[PDB]
């Protein structure tokens, strides 16, 4: 029964909710395990950056967010084509690839192309056989000054 | 303070592990300190006791400077029996009373080759600690 002036409430507790209650007492355990998996990954890919491959600049859709740019899934094949990077060697030198993504405008295409050309300028590539350097591989000075990068690779700013 | 997350400090777990310990772990629990002269001779503080150590009782009713050999190491009630450490029943027969080896000072070991091997191992690990500290 209702009393005087108050809200009409509809609590969704008419099912047997107490079997499927998910407590979070393993929250710092999940956080601590995710942290150790992150440092294990970072230790495994030792000079490659810890967060992962480079992600492109994408405009969010759906007018609430279309002023904001963010990181997309991968560089699109025409962006790699204009940057002159093979779409199978991109994922080997650390470039995210999205085959599914179209371009509709020139400027986002060119901004991600310049991002690719800004990333290959920073890329220090170790030779494939360690006692024999090859044609496009980085020189022994940037090999000795290679470090593991933290955070997103060249993070995206508004 | 213990920091190892695999070693328990739970009272009931420690008590269960102590009172259900198998006999070769019981031997290590039933360990007696050596004498001051035996400490300066072998550089060993503590040793598991055997069926032939000449020992002294230093705590209890049967304490004193008298020396008796261990005659039985009764691992199931965690006690040992020493020679003149006895009491008489109603009927006049003497029985041996149980003494815990922590209240027992060893003044003469049964030196077996196993015992000498254990004594050398304990002395060497103690000296590794002493020469690691500096």
């Amino acid at each position: 029964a209702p009393s005087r002036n108050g809200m009409i409430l509809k609590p969704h507790f008419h099912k047997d909710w107490q079997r499927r209650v998910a407590t979070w007492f393993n929250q710092p355990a999940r956080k601590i395990r995710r942290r150790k998996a992150r440092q294990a990954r970072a230790r495994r890919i030792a000079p490659r950056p810890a967060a992962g491959p480079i992600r492109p600049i994408v405009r969010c859709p759906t007018v609430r967010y279309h002023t904001k740019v963010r990181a997309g899934r991968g560089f699109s094949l025409e962006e790699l084509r204009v940057a002159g990077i093979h779409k199978k060697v991109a994922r080997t030198i650390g470039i995210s690839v999205d085959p599914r993504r179209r371009n509709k405008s020139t400027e986002s295409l060119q901004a991600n192309v310049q991002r690719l050309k800004e990333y290959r300028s920073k890329l220090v590539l170790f030779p494939r056989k360690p006692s024999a350097p090859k044609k496009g591989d980085s020189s022994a000075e940037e090999l000795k000054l290679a470090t593991q990068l933290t955070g997103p690779v060249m993070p995206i700013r508004n | 303070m213990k920091f190892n997350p695999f070693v328990t400090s739970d009272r009931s777990k420690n008590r269960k592990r102590h009172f259900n310990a198998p006999s070769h772990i019981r031997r290590k629990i039933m360990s007696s300190p050596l004498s001051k002269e035996l400490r300066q001779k072998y550089n060993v503080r503590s040793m598991p006791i055997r069926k032939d150590d000449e020992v002294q009782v230093v705590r209890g009713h049967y304490k004193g400077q008298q020396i008796g050999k261990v005659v039985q190491v009764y691992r199931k009630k965690y006690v040992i029996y020493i020679e003149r450490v006895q009491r008489e029943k109603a009927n006049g027969t003497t029985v041996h009373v149980g003494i815990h080896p922590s209240k027992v000072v060893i003044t003469r070991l049964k030196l077996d080759k196993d015992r000498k091997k254990i004594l050398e191992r304990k002395a060497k690990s103690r000296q590794v600690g002493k020469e690691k500290g500096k």
Binding site: T23, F25 | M1, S9, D10, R11
Partner: protein, 259 residues
């Protein structure tokens, strides 16, 4: 408690008739547990009233400004000699209460250097009081892994750990804290302000960047400044007997007019 506790029987009430009290009772069998009062908080066996669930709200979030407020207030109280003595720390011979020892002692390794440092800083009497307060706890905490209780000695607060934690951690009552990670639970134990603190020098100097002055915000926090005093002169006696108030007071009526 387990949610199956006391509900692991089949039990029907006998209904009316039978001259018994209408509670559910155990079915059949030749044993003691037969017609013997199964469900309900009032029976032997059976679940308790309102069985405790795991999803009680165990955890309480406090606002970040209030958590820094309490750290500020506990630190501020740990510099007044009356409040720490009312907390019971034996400081009647320490040479200054915000007791800052120089930064060499963060590089300690052995416990004997720590003990000699406390003895020469006259804070060893607090550890001796902690030793005197070592005793067994009254009650079921002894059977619940909390056999021994003891009071708190000082809190050594440091900037960088060059072995001071291992050199001090075997002395009872001493809590080690980094200035970047100051704990209100360890800086006001029991909710009572007045914990004795022994600072190191760089630890002491980083306080004006961790929490700020009033003119400058906190350099090591995002947006935090020191809280503001609701009154600035708290010397009520000095306020009241100052001439400005006394010229405006009326004459006091100090005379007892009984019946």
């Amino acid at each position: 408690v387990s949610e199956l506790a006391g509900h692991q029987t089949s039990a029907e009430s006998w209904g009316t008739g039978r001259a018994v009290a209408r509670i559910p009772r155990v079915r059949g069998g030749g044993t003691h547990r037969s017609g013997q009062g199964a469900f309900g908080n009032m029976c032997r066996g059976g679940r308790m009233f309102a069985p405790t669930k795991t999803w009680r709200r165990w955890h309480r979030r406090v606002n970040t400004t209030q958590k820094r407020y309490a750290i500020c207030s506990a630190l501020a109280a740990s510099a007044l000699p009356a409040l720490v003595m009312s907390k019971g720390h034996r400081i009647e011979e320490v040479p200054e209460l915000p007791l800052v020892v120089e930064d060499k002692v963060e590089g300690y390794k052995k416990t004997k250097e720590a003990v000699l440092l406390l003895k020469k800083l006259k804070a060893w009497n607090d550890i001796k009081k902690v030793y005197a307060s070592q005793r067994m706890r009254a009650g079921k905490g002894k059977m619940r892994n909390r056999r021994r209780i003891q009071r708190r000695g000082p809190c050594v607060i440091y900037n960088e750990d060059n072995g001071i934690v291992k050199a001090f951690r075997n002395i009872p009552g001493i809590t080690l804290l980094n200035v970047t990670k100051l704990n209100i639970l360890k800086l006001a134990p029991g909710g009572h302000v007045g914990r004795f603190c022994i600072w190191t020098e760089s630890a002491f100097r980083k306080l004006d960047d961790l929490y700020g002055t009033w003119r400058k915000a906190a350099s090591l926090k995002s947006n935090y400044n020191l809280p503001m005093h609701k009154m600035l002169n708290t010397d009520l006696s000095r306020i009241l007997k100052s001439p400005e108030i006394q010229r405006a007071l009326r004459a006091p009526r100090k005379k007892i007019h009984r019946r």
